[PDB]
């Protein structure tokens, strides 16, 4: 089964539905069911990648092709005055889904320490 | 001036210097002066690109090469348990520093939401 067997995989295959924002060939974007932000959207690879740890250098292009598609979403999303950007790997990481992705939250001011 | 005119310039043009913890002909890894956790890190495009808002197309695999240089030095530092990578765009994301860079903390565990 394409798109790998977690929860994701389920929404890449459209087994299951979500507020999908953005779909190319490569990765699909669609809001968190579980917001931290005003905006609070997440941007996946269409491959399985299960960790960023467990990534490839021919991933390379991939992995910056989401955070290119987490800034033109977060524009249509009028993210103005910014964003961060999140992927987290492993139990230290907060990872609980094993499937690469990464969060893209706005419309508040994010504070520090990120977590 | 290469590297931009910011403060990480000066580091990329070795003007300052930095605890640097890999270097190639693409970016750079170093330390971060106000840890947020045992291990915190950045790595920073050699190019200058004053945020992710701004990356054009064309900076796809240069992202992504960040992350992938980020996972490695991770690995090297001994992060078995995992991390968190972060990427702050403009006021609310809480970015200071103009010139694109890409947070990696660990040794601890990383709670949520992340800020």
């Known amino acids: 089964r394409p798109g790998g067997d977690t929860i994701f995989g389920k929404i890449i295959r459209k087994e299951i539905p ?3 924002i953005f779909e190319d060939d490569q990765c699909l974007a669609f809001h968190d069911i579980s917001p931290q932000a005003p905006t609070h959207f997440l941007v ?5 990648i299960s960790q960023i740890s467990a990534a490839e250098d021919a991933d390379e292009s991939l992995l910056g092709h989401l955070m290119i598609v987490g800034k033109k979403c977060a524009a249509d999303l009028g993210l103005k005055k910014g964003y961060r950007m999140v992927v987290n790997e492993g139990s230290d990481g907060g990872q609980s889904v094993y499937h690469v992705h990464l969060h ?3 419309g508040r001011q994010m504070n ?3 977590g």
Request: proline share 21%; glycine share 8%.
């Open 18 to 20: 979500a507020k999908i």
């Open 44 to 48: 996946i690879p269409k491959k399985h």
């Open 104 to 106: 893209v939250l706005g």
């Open 112 to 114: 520090w320490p990120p």
